[PDB]
Design an enzyme around this catalytic site. Structure first.
Site, PDB file in Angstrom:
ATOM      1  CG  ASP A  14      10.564  53.842  36.763  1.00  0.00           C
ATOM      2  OD1 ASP A  14       9.746  54.633  36.186  1.00  0.00           O
ATOM      3  OD2 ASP A  14      10.206  52.804  37.388  1.00  0.00           O
ATOM      4  CE  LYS A  17      10.930  62.069  36.016  1.00  0.00           C
ATOM      5  NZ  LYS A  17      11.490  60.733  35.739  1.00  0.00           N
ATOM      6  CB  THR A  18       6.925  59.625  41.303  1.00  0.00           C
ATOM      7  OG1 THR A  18       6.672  60.223  40.042  1.00  0.00           O
ATOM      8  CG2 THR A  18       5.590  59.506  42.070  1.00  0.00           C
ATOM      9  CG  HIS A  77      11.049  62.598  27.317  1.00  0.00           C
ATOM     10  ND1 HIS A  77      12.020  63.401  27.907  1.00  0.00           N
ATOM     11  CD2 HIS A  77      10.999  62.872  25.990  1.00  0.00           C
ATOM     12  CE1 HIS A  77      12.531  64.121  26.921  1.00  0.00           C
ATOM     13  NE2 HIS A  77      11.948  63.841  25.751  1.00  0.00           N
TER      14      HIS A  77
HETATM   15  N1  GDP Z   1      17.163  51.466  45.666  1.00  0.00           N
HETATM   16  C1  GDP Z   1      16.369  52.532  45.509  1.00  0.00           C
HETATM   17  N2  GDP Z   1      15.327  52.460  44.674  1.00  0.00           N
HETATM   18  C2  GDP Z   1      14.570  53.579  44.683  1.00  0.00           C
HETATM   19  C3  GDP Z   1      14.784  54.747  45.408  1.00  0.00           C
HETATM   20  N3  GDP Z   1      13.768  55.655  45.169  1.00  0.00           N
HETATM   21  C4  GDP Z   1      12.977  55.034  44.335  1.00  0.00           C
HETATM   22  N4  GDP Z   1      13.380  53.767  44.013  1.00  0.00           N
HETATM   23  C5  GDP Z   1      12.551  52.806  43.262  1.00  0.00           C
HETATM   24  O1  GDP Z   1      12.792  52.984  41.878  1.00  0.00           O
HETATM   25  C6  GDP Z   1      11.553  52.881  41.134  1.00  0.00           C
HETATM   26  C7  GDP Z   1      11.335  54.102  40.267  1.00  0.00           C
HETATM   27  O2  GDP Z   1      10.898  55.259  41.025  1.00  0.00           O
HETATM   28  P1  GDP Z   1      10.003  56.495  40.480  1.00  0.00           P
HETATM   29  O3  GDP Z   1       9.883  57.588  41.469  1.00  0.00           O
HETATM   30  O4  GDP Z   1       8.574  55.983  40.166  1.00  0.00           O
HETATM   31  O5  GDP Z   1      10.749  57.037  39.179  1.00  0.00           O
HETATM   32  P2  GDP Z   1      10.340  58.147  38.108  1.00  0.00           P
HETATM   33  O6  GDP Z   1       9.529  57.607  36.861  1.00  0.00           O
HETATM   34  O7  GDP Z   1      11.686  58.803  37.679  1.00  0.00           O
HETATM   35  O8  GDP Z   1       9.562  59.131  38.938  1.00  0.00           O
HETATM   36  C8  GDP Z   1      10.452  52.587  42.153  1.00  0.00           C
HETATM   37  O9  GDP Z   1      10.073  51.218  42.181  1.00  0.00           O
HETATM   38  C9  GDP Z   1      11.056  53.074  43.472  1.00  0.00           C
HETATM   39  O10 GDP Z   1      10.513  52.462  44.638  1.00  0.00           O
HETATM   40  C10 GDP Z   1      15.924  54.816  46.296  1.00  0.00           C
HETATM   41  O11 GDP Z   1      16.237  55.742  47.046  1.00  0.00           O
HETATM   42  N5  GDP Z   1      16.661  53.642  46.273  1.00  0.00           N
HETATM   43 MG    MG Z   2       7.711  59.110  38.354  1.00  0.00          MG
END
Ligand code: GDP
Ligand code: MG
EC number: 3.6.5.3
Length: 385
Positions: A14, A17-18, A77
């Site tokens: 979270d 990345k996505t 992961h």
């Molecule tokens: N404040 C903030 N939150 C973000 C940002 N980008 C993503 N998030 C939020 O953080 C959460 C995790 O994002 P995600 O892409 O699914 O993470 P992943 O599992 O690493 O790919 C989501 O609810 C996003 O909307 C950003 O630029 N700023």
């Molecule tokens: Mg993701």
């Protein structure tokens, strides 16, 4: 036409990345055309099969004005581990996503560790969720922590491009934050150099078969993996036996006499001087002094779970499977890490392998682990000992 580059987003769960993969597709489409992909479409990644092993991975495609990018983003992961060890396409570069609110986390370290182990040559970092951080001293601290982390794993931390941004606010349309995603696409193009074409790499032909044409001499057959072999050029036969030196006395393609053999061509290479009895299974033809034969290597390996068609029982210190490199299985001895007694199906470990015969080998070479004729795992040569 335009160069193809395999990239992907790495980093802790979270971190963004996505959201970043979505923002990249969205902003690049909004700026210089293409199709924009939503967060939902990339998030629920389909399940892919890599020789029996199951991996949840999203393959997104995007274009910068000069390059075409094939981007991988995985949910968990475990998928990243599997993908880096046996995944369809080897990464030419990676985007390390770090949330400025959390900083580097256990999977941040792990992905950097695996990245070098597996030979990912370039890492660009996107410092995400900066919309949430009001302290500039905090951003500098996270940035320094990331540069220290990269340098710890031999990546040039001091020279790594670091983009400060917000993947969410950019997916949202905010121009000020959309600029930073364009700055990131700029680093993809400038920092990751153009990938090397197979034809421009040193000549290598893995030997598939041997015959001996009456009066012409020994014919070695195979698909040219890399480079070009011209008639008259010197070659080395590297593999199980002591390395032999010879000269390409001819190149044939189903009766057609060629003056040269290029990458991707199924060819018959004539070697004056060499005798049939001197050629063994697992040997390679190569540009002299470009590859070395080795028996001992360090590798990062993944063992298939029972579910993936692998074994149901663990193996121990005395395990002696077959290692399928390019053309043949070679039996190897295994040394497990200090304290490890057994390896369970579905696990990944660092294995020190000792082959019964030397094999033409370099770091990054992928192999399969087979027990009968059935795949029990896959690996990558991390270090050649
Ligand atoms: N404040 C903030 N939150 C973000 C940002 N980008 C993503 N998030 C939020 O953080 C959460 C995790 O994002 P995600 O892409 O699914 O993470 P992943 O599992 O690493 O790919 C989501 O609810 C996003 O909307 C950003 O630029 N700023
Ligand atoms: Mg993701």
């Amino acid at each position: 036409t335009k160069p193809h580059v395999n990239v992907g987003t790495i980093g802790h769960v979270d971190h963004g990345k996505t959201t970043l993969t979505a923002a990249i597709t969205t902003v690049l489409a909004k700026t210089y055309g293409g199709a924009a992909r939503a967060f939902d479409q990339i998030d629920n990644a389909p399940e892919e099969k890599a020789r029996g092993i199951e991996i949840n991975t999203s393959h997104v495609e995007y274009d910068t004005p000069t390059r075409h990018y094939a981007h991988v983003d995985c949910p968990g992961h475990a998928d990243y581990v599997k993908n880096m060890i046996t995944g369809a396409a080897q990464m030419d570069g990676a985007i390390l996503v770090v949330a400025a609110t959390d900083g580097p986390m256990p999977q941040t370290r792990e992905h950097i560790l695996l990245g070098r182990q597996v030979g990912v040559p370039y890492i660009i970092v996107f410092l995400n969720k900066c919309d949430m951080v009001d302290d500039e001293e905090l951003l500098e601290l996270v940035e320094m922590e990331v540069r220290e982390l990269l340098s710890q794993y031999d990546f040039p931390g001091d020279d790594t491009p670091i983009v400060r941004g917000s993947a969410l606010k950019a997916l949202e349309g905010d121009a000020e934050w959309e600029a930073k995603i364009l700055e990131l696409a700029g680093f993809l193009d400038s920092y990751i150099p153009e990938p090397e074409r197979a034809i421009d790499k040193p000549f290598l032909l893995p030997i598939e078969d041997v015959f001996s044409i009456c009066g012409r001499g020994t014919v070695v057959t195979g698909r040219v993996e890399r480079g070009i072999i011209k008639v008259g050029e010197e070659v080395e036969i590297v593999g199980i036996k002591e390395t032999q030196k010879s000269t390409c006395t001819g190149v044939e393609m189903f009766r057609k006499l060629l003056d040269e053999g290029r990458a991707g061509e199924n060819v018959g290479v004539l070697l004056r001087g060499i005798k049939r009895e001197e050629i063994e299974r697992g040997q390679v033809l190569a540009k002299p002094g470009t590859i070395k034969p080795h028996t001992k290597f360090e590798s990062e390996v993944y063992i298939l779970s029972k579910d993936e068609g692998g074994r149901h029982t663990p193996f121990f210190k005395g395990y002696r499977p077959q290692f399928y490199f390019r053309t043949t299985d070679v039996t190897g001895t295994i040394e497990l890490p200090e304290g490890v007694e057994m390896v369970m199906p579905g696990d990944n470990i660092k294995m020190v392998v000792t082959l019964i015969h030397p094999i033409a080998m370099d770091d990054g070479l992928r192999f399969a682990i087979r027990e009968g004729g059935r795949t029990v795992g896959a690996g990558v040569v991390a270090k050649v000992l």
